[PDB]
């Protein structure tokens, strides 16, 4: 519905038949996910931050739930400190920026 | 993501 | 992309 | 004003007298800016991100302009790809997420 920024914007999300935390990263632009199994082909990549870059494997057309609300889209995975979702699954979810 | 760490 |  | 996030959420923020862009980023709990001349005195410190770690200048009590709203905090000053609002001034401006 809504949320403050008080605090981590932590969301409970459900991918790959797993149970994670996430944080709600509206200046990611794209889906990070710590380490984990994840079913199906991937393609190399590599995305930027502070502090360096790092090497991640792209998974497309992934399903994934975030606090109940259904989407699909790409998620990179790698030696991300936290896992994150960025605005392209942001948007699925009719996430807005309000102030 | 900006960690204050 | 970048993850800023 | 209400922001969806089909692109990415930049703003105009004034400080130290002077006008940058900047990313409105939930994920972020700290304020960061590329190097830019600010007054006052700073004290080191090394924030994290994805790619790994940053050294940067901390100033406390700098008053930022967001987008026409003022808010007053910590500001961290170093080598960022891009300049970054975090929580600790995003509070001040009353954002929030909606989904």
Known sequence: ?99 | YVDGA | ?4
Chains 1, 4 share one sequence.
């Not at chain 1, 399903?63 to 400190?81: D, M, N, R, S």
Request: proline fraction near 6%.
């Open chain 1, 1 to 99: 519905p809504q949320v403050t920024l008080w605090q981590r914007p932590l969301v409970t999300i459900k991918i790959g038949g797993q149970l994670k935390e996430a944080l709600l990263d509206t200046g990611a632009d794209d889906t990070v996910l710590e380490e984990m199994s994840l079913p199906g082909r991937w393609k190399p990549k590599m995305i930027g931050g502070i502090g360096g870059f790092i090497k991640v494997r792209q998974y497309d057309q992934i399903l994934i739930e975030i606090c109940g609300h259904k989407a699909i889209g790409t998620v990179l995975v790698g030696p991300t400190p936290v896992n994150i979702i960025g605005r392209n699954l942001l948007t699925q979810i009719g996430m807005t920026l309000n102030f």
């Open chain 3, 1 to 4: 992309a970048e993850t800023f």
